[PDB]
């Protein structure tokens, strides 16, 4: 979910 999308994006 979204926490991992933030991790990948940053």
């Amino acid at each position: 979910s979204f926490k991992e999308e933030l991790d990948k994006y940053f």
């Epitope: 979910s1 979204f2 926490k3 933030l6 991790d7 994006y9 940053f10």
Partner: antibody, heavy 119, light 113 residues
Framework: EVQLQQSGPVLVKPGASVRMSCKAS????????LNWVKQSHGKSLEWLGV????????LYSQTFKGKATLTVDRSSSTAYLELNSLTSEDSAVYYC????????????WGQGTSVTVSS | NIMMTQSPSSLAVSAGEKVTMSCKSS????????????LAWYQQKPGQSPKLLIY???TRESGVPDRFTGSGSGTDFTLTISSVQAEDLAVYFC????????FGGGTKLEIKR
């Protein structure tokens, strides 16, 4: 000094689109991410998404996916937020806010752009 | 999304009094790779943009007066102002950035005189 200078207030009709700007000065724009955050009625805060000025790539809240478009002109150190299909519920102050990296808070905010959507 | 709930909605104190305000998250905001709570507090004075006070739940941002202290872990966070000054009137927001960013509804600090 760091500054984020946002474009001025605007009136737009329902169904139209609007694009507003956020110009970074006092620092190199590609050194920090830029977030956009909506404030309704001077209080409630809602995140739209985040752009990376270096790559130009963005990550959006599911709420704003396909509604907001984040872009950047690195040459003029200026970020842009475009909103489409505007409704009365899109009237708000839109802030841009810099974020150094994943773990950081939003350490500096522009002065906001007031958008009114009305007939 | 992680839901942020702040209490009280507003409070009023005289200058020099200590205040505490609460921010609860609906789930943990602890980021595993750095073991930091991805929780920030902002101060928004009337007519101004929000100003970052605290991040990682308890680390004060440079230039923030030391009367402001963030604390807490798990789902329960607190902002304490040790000795309120007249210029501290503002709406104070919490913010989680572990997942899709969300903010609390704010606590409005008013001043008694």
């Amino acid at each position: 000094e760091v500054q984020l200078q946002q474009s001025g207030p605007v009136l737009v009709k329902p169904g139209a689109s609007v694009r507003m700007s956020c110009k970074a000065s006092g620092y190199t724009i590609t050194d920090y991410y830029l977030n956009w955050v909506k404030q309704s009625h001077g209080k409630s805060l809602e995140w739209l998404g985040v752009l990376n000025p270096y790559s130009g790539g963005s990550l959006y809240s599911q709420t704003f996916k396909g509604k907001a478009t984040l872009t950047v002109d690195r040459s003029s150190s200026t970020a842009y937020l475009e909103l489409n299909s505007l409704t009365s519920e899109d009237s708000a102050v839109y802030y841009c806010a810099r974020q150094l990296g994943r773990g950081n808070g939003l350490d500096y905010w522009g002065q906001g752009t007031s958008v009114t959507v009305s007939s | 999304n992680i839901m942020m709930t702040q209490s009280p909605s507003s409070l009023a104190v005289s200058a020099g009094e200590k205040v505490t305000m609460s921010c609860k998250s609906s789930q943990s905001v602890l980021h595993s790779s750095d073991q930091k709570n991805y929780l920030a507090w902002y101060q928004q004075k009337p007519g101004q943009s929000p100003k970052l006070l605290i991040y990682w739940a308890s680390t004060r941002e440079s230039g923030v007066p030391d009367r402001f202290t963030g604390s807490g872990s798990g789902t329960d966070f607190t902002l304490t102002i040790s000795s309120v000054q007249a210029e501290d009137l503002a709406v104070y927001f919490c913010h989680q950035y572990l997942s899709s960013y969300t903010f609390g509804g704010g606590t409005k600090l008013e001043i008694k005189r």
